[PDB]
């Protein structure tokens, strides 16, 4: 057998590796021809890199979409070198990092063998990059795994410029027997525009291979509605009323209760809900209830997942960047309050105007009725361009937060509204945290402070 020839990025190429990339130019040309790479496929070659390339000998091949590169350069990479592991895709809007984690785990702890795409800050679940097949390549050198645990991105674009069935592409090329759909929520404005042009997406990760399982989720409408997708598919669901289920004595696999309430390590509802997703497809991959709920039991989660950073006062770390998720995490706060709720939320820089308007409607409905304060930081202080907060941005932020009449304040370093809040707070009080980049530095402030 040979471990060489393998599809890289630019970055980890050697002898005889092929190098995708989106674009290059003629430092790439010279640093590939270095590193003696067989091959680049591009969708561009900048300038003068095409004659450059054909000066070293490095052979050159321009798709008209390096998307589709990458799913054929991850097909034969999957039949290379694992075609007869057994393969789960999880993909959705929200949870799909924190479902996908807690089945690779599930199979870990079981002592098999699985490779996991997924990590806190999920950027390698795209066919941008030939990341995900140089890593399975890297991890089955010294024997292929048992398991493919695999996050697929419902949504993705390069220059904004929407891939149309990223998802069912991806999918199609992994060919799992298995399939997870966590949710359909809003988010990423511009490549979608309606809550339909998401389903559509979502949806096609179904459409993408002939036979296998469906894992649904009870709970969504929409997702619920996917079972007449591909009449090829056995359909398992989760959630309520279903085999997989919770309520209060727990978590019910099958008829009898597996997980009780206080043996599970965190309540909220998104671990709740992926833990539910997580244990349906473990299910169909043959594992038993009892292999779950030692899982379950074993459970580390992701960065800023509801993570507890302080006790009196409750300080909580969410990841909260979509309305849906918004809700869902001021849900599970509000649900253990002894006192005043302090959120300090972070304007989602240089998303655009959309983002940002439905977020600060969503934090304004679920703070209504409670006895809550909203600081809302730009976090100049500790954010790059990349995720720099615009004046039309914040603006658009604050309007709807005026127009509503939530009790707000904008402090415009991190900074100065995490000094703010830690003050004003009493030790019954609990204050959660959301954002996304904006909001990733808030842990190691925190201990700067204390």
Not at 92 to 102: A, L
Request: aromatic share 4%; net charge negative; glycine share 8%.
């Amino acid at each position: 057998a040979s471990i060489s020839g393998i599809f890289t990025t630019l970055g980890a190429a050697e002898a005889g590796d092929i190098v995708i990339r989106h674009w290059i130019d003629e430092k790439g040309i010279e640093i590939a021809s270095e590193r003696g790479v067989s091959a680049i496929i591009t969708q561009d070659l900048r300038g003068k890199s095409s004659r450059l390339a054909e000066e070293h000998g490095l052979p050159v091949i321009l798709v008209d979409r390096i998307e589709n590169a990458n799913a054929l350069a991850l097909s034969w990479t999957i039949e290379r070198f694992a075609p007869s592991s057994r393969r789960v895709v999880v993909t959705g809007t929200n949870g799909k990092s924190t479902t996908t984690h807690m089945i690779h785990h599930i199979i870990e702890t079981t002592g098999a063998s699985s490779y996991t795409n997924t990590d806190s800050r999920s950027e390698f679940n795209t066919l941008i990059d030939p990341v995900v097949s140089q890593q399975i390549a890297e991890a089955s050198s010294d024997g292929a795994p048992e398991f493919m645990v695999i996050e697929v991105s419902e949504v993705q674009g390069w220059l904004g410029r929407v891939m149309r069935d990223h998802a069912r592409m991806m999918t199609a090329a992994i060919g799992p027997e298995v399939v997870v759909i966590t949710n359909v929520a809003m988010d990423h404005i511009g490549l979608v525009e309606s809550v339909e042009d998401v389903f559509r997406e979502v949806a096609g990760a179904l459409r993408a291979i002939e036979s296998g399982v469906a894992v649904l989720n009870a709970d969504d409408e929409r997702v619920r509605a996917m079972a007449h997708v591909n009449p090829g598919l056995s359909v398992v669901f989760y959630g309520s009323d279903s085999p997989v289920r919770y309520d209060g004595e727990g978590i019910h696999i099958g008829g009898d209760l597996i997980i009780p309430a206080e043996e599970l390590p965190f309540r909220s509802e998104h671990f709740i809900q992926n833990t539910l997703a997580a244990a349906a497809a473990c299910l169909e991959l043959g594992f038993s209830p009892e292999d779950i709920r030692m899982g379950v039991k074993t459970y580390r989660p992701l960065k800023r997942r509801f993570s507890v950073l302080m006790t009196e006062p409750l300080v909580i770390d969410d990841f909260a960047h979509n309305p849906s998720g918004i809700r869902f995490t001021v849900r599970s706060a509000a649900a253990n309050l002894r006192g005043r709720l302090w959120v300090v939320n972070a304007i989602r820089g240089s998303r655009g105007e959309d983002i940002n308007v439905m977020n600060a409607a969503a934090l304004a409905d679920s703070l209504r009725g409670l006895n809550a304060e909203l600081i809302v930081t730009s976090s100049s202080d500790v954010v790059d361009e990349q995720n720099r907060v615009l004046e039309n941005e914040r603006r658009a932020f604050l309007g709807v937060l005026d127009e509503r009449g939530a009790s707000y304040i904008h402090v415009e370093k991190l900074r100065d509204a995490l000094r703010m809040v830690l003050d004003a707070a009493k030790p019954h009080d609990t204050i959660l945290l959301l954002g996304a980049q904006g909001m990733d530095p808030a842990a190691g402030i925190i201990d700067e402070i204390r």
